[PDB]
Amino acid sequence: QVQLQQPGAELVKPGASVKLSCKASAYTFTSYWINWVKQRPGQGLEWIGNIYPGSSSTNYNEKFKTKATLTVDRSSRTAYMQLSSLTSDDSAVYYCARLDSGDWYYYGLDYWGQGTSVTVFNQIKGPSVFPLAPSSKSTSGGTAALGCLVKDYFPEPVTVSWNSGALTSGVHTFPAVLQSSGLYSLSSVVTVPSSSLGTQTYICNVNHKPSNTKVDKRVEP
Amino acid sequence: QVQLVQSGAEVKKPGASVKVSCKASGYTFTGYYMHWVRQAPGQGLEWMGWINPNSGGTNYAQKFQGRVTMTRDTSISTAYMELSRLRSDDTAVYYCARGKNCDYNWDFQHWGQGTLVTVSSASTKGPSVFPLAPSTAALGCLVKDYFPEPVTVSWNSGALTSGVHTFPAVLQSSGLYSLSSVVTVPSSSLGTQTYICNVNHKPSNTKVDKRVEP
Amino acid sequence: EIVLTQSPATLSLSPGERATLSCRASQSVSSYLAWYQQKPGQAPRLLIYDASNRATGIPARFSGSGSGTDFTLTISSLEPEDFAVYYCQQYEFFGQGTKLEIKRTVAAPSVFIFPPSDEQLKSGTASVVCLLNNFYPREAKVQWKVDNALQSGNSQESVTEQDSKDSTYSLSSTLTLSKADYEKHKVYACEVTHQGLSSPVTKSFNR
Amino acid sequence: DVLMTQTPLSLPVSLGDQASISCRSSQNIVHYNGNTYLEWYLQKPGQSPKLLIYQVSNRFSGVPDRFSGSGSGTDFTLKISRVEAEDLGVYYCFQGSHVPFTFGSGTKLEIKRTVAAPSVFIFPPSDEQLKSGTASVVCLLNNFYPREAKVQWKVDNALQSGNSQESVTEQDSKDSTYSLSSTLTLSKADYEKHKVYACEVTHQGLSSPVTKSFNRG
Ligand SMILES: [K+]
Ligand SMILES: [K+]
Ligand SMILES: [K+]
């Protein structure tokens, strides 16, 4: 049982529109304002507007007056927010959150959905996966680092796992970096005993769902 | 038996200040905020601020901050609103108003009678009464170049009231008010009966009578 | 801030009809609102508080409803005493108001025109009055013409309140002319346009 | 709009110590009804925000004693009495007295731990990548704290600039360390022109700057 529910993600093109939804329970739909909040990756929270389901009364943040349109469907107790003329800047997580009603609210945004990720993509480009191997003079009998260079992909995200998930401890998949290329690049690293290099297989599994690309790169010395 | 009685009308020059009072009766003065609302002639309602009569704390409307002051005197259960740096725009009726319930209530169930405040560079003057000549016909008087409001018009000392319209005063660029009083009468008694306007302006004590004829 | 949008600005109904006023509190999450009635020369009077609650002494024909920040005041069987201005209110904000007016049968104005007094000319200025009497609706456009010269900017209008008995209006338009500007002119007219006039009506006199 | 200025953007705190976060509203945010609508929200990593304190000083359902809110008018403070590892996240103040509602900058709570020098590793470009045309040289700094670190590439003893791009992990929730990568991108032509490639790391935990190198081929 949840009070608000949101779909997971949306992949959308610039200039297009996308309609995010937020399924509410009767308990919330009856008495709560439904608020939408933007969070760009790594940035902070930004309030867009809200709507009273019983009346479709709306409130807006002037910056989103033209970007965002709020509606509700009474029969499904679902809140919608249409985002128009999408741009790179609209790539973000959008949250649903309820606000109690009355002579103004009283508590606050006490129940939040889990958010819907929106990615605005102009091109779909799979990644190139290159090995970051430990070189000739890696101190023998110590600890060695190996990794995978996932270069030149667009849009985010890429999932990276090691040995199909069996190897997690000490894995560091770094935040992606946007290059002058306009493409994304990142590296995933893991540290292991040096003595294991001649023996144990080490494979990075890089998945780029935007292009439905699965790549398994073996990292050898 | 709640009652809010305000001071009388005022006339002030631009740049001056005015202090309106509001005496409360029939309840614990300190137990209800006192609000102030004004209304320019022929305009909507405009909130100015409230005062907590128990602490003296105030909130002033953004528009008036810096030239509005609200105070109180719990002993005599009176609230005051002083408006300074007066402008012509500030010509209006100023009301005191009290919430229906305690603390932060905005339901104005109790109102004062209002206090008209005229702000003008003009000085008191008497009206220039002129007749409106008959060409059912129409007789009338023209009350011209007078200040301040109000002026009253009567026809034949109240003998004739049906069909009589005293028009709302109008403020000229001169700064003076001007209005016209008319009356529709049958052409039968144009020669038989006399018609005069009992025009009176208490502020400048100008009682004047003008009779109309073809 | 909060922005209260009251509609309609004017409402023309006959007694016994049902009036419906609307108020919208934008940029607000308050679900409560008050309504006031104001007649000429008196302070506003509280009708409804908390969206649907009537104040003390308010007749049952006054009903108030709210949903979200959309509110309505409904008056069933409009009594003659109910024709006045009405205001919505949320906190410090008042709506623009709704003038609830009595609708009656269209009535054309009986037009009258008066030349300047001669005493007013002994004073040194001239003012010519034009009257539209007992007409309905309130809308009317009056035009002046000096020797067939459509004049502008030197006229002033005044309109009575709706008559309590016959429900009509009267209008006072006064032309202010310099005695120097006036006596050196021949024929000045007052051309009235009204919804109950087939064609516009003109009234005139030679100086 | 009411602007909410939040201080500090980053708040290093040691477990068991007190954390205090400040928020100031550009306007008075005491509402017409007498309430002050300032709330404090916490967004843990990978989670949706949650409401901690409401109406300046009231704890929301299920919020432990060690969270406290104080303030009046425009000046507000959040305090966490005995910080715990599970308190890690971004704290946001929020005003709801004026529409549009507004959130603060967000204050990232960083766990203060003992100094930890990085282990530095260097990776030469792929042989596979080199046929493509580009050459990426990755220098890794692993499990260090604090996050301030200087990365410098030296190509045949010649310093570099405009050539690198850094990336840093979020603070680990368990050991509270950071890890950092510095990628030196270069054309194959340029890469084969020079021989030595080294990244020089400076860090509080290190006695002196550490350098790690390889010779092309
Ligand atoms: K869903
Ligand atoms: K649901
Ligand atoms: K549906």
Short mmCIF file of N, CA and C in Angstrom, two decimals, chain A residues 42-44, chain D residues 4-12 20-23 40 89-93 103-110 170 178:
data_model
loop_
_atom_site.label_atom_id
_atom_site.label_comp_id
_atom_site.label_asym_id
_atom_site.label_seq_id
_atom_site.Cartn_x
_atom_site.Cartn_y
_atom_site.Cartn_z
N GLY A 42 22.23 15.66 -9.39
CA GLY A 42 23.22 16.30 -8.55
C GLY A 42 22.83 17.64 -7.98
N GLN A 43 21.79 18.28 -8.52
CA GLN A 43 21.36 19.58 -8.05
C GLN A 43 20.29 19.40 -6.96
N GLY A 44 19.63 20.50 -6.58
CA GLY A 44 18.67 20.48 -5.51
C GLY A 44 17.23 20.41 -5.99
N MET D 4 15.46 31.35 -0.29
CA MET D 4 15.90 30.70 0.94
C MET D 4 17.40 30.47 0.83
N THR D 5 18.17 31.19 1.64
CA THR D 5 19.62 31.08 1.65
C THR D 5 20.03 30.13 2.77
N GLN D 6 20.69 29.04 2.40
CA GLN D 6 21.03 27.96 3.32
C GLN D 6 22.54 27.92 3.53
N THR D 7 22.94 27.72 4.79
CA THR D 7 24.34 27.78 5.17
C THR D 7 24.64 26.64 6.14
N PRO D 8 25.67 25.82 5.88
CA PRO D 8 26.60 25.80 4.74
C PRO D 8 26.15 24.83 3.67
N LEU D 9 26.73 24.94 2.47
CA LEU D 9 26.41 23.96 1.43
C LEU D 9 27.01 22.60 1.77
N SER D 10 28.15 22.58 2.46
CA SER D 10 28.79 21.35 2.91
C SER D 10 29.10 21.48 4.39
N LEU D 11 28.74 20.45 5.17
CA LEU D 11 28.86 20.48 6.62
C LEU D 11 29.58 19.24 7.11
N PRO D 12 30.91 19.29 7.22
CA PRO D 12 31.65 18.16 7.81
C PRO D 12 31.36 18.05 9.30
N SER D 20 24.68 21.76 12.91
CA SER D 20 23.71 22.85 12.88
C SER D 20 23.71 23.47 11.49
N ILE D 21 22.52 23.59 10.91
CA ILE D 21 22.30 24.11 9.57
C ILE D 21 21.44 25.36 9.68
N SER D 22 21.80 26.39 8.94
CA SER D 22 21.09 27.66 9.00
C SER D 22 20.40 27.96 7.68
N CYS D 23 19.21 28.56 7.74
CA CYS D 23 18.41 28.94 6.58
C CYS D 23 17.86 30.35 6.84
N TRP D 40 11.93 21.44 7.29
CA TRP D 40 13.24 20.89 7.01
C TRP D 40 13.05 19.50 6.43
N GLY D 89 23.13 12.63 4.22
CA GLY D 89 22.21 13.04 3.18
C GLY D 89 22.27 14.54 3.00
N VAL D 90 21.31 15.04 2.22
CA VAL D 90 21.21 16.47 1.92
C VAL D 90 19.99 17.02 2.64
N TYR D 91 20.19 18.07 3.43
CA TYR D 91 19.13 18.69 4.21
C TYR D 91 18.68 19.96 3.51
N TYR D 92 17.38 20.17 3.41
CA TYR D 92 16.85 21.31 2.73
C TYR D 92 15.86 22.06 3.58
N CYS D 93 15.95 23.36 3.63
CA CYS D 93 14.93 24.13 4.27
C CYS D 93 13.89 24.46 3.21
N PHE D 103 12.57 25.98 -2.02
CA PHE D 103 13.51 25.16 -1.28
C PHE D 103 14.82 25.90 -1.16
N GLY D 104 15.58 25.57 -0.12
CA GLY D 104 16.92 26.08 0.04
C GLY D 104 17.91 25.37 -0.86
N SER D 105 19.15 25.85 -0.80
CA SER D 105 20.23 25.29 -1.59
C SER D 105 20.39 23.79 -1.35
N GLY D 106 20.16 23.36 -0.12
CA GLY D 106 20.54 22.03 0.30
C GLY D 106 21.89 22.05 0.99
N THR D 107 21.98 21.39 2.14
CA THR D 107 23.22 21.27 2.89
C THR D 107 23.62 19.80 2.92
N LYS D 108 24.75 19.48 2.29
CA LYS D 108 25.25 18.11 2.28
C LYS D 108 25.96 17.84 3.60
N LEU D 109 25.47 16.86 4.35
CA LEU D 109 26.13 16.44 5.58
C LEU D 109 27.24 15.47 5.23
N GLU D 110 28.48 15.84 5.54
CA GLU D 110 29.65 15.01 5.31
C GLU D 110 30.14 14.46 6.64
N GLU D 170 30.74 10.01 -4.61
CA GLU D 170 30.09 10.46 -3.40
C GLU D 170 30.77 9.80 -2.20
N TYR D 178 36.58 9.02 -0.05
CA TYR D 178 36.36 9.37 -1.44
C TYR D 178 37.34 8.61 -2.32
#
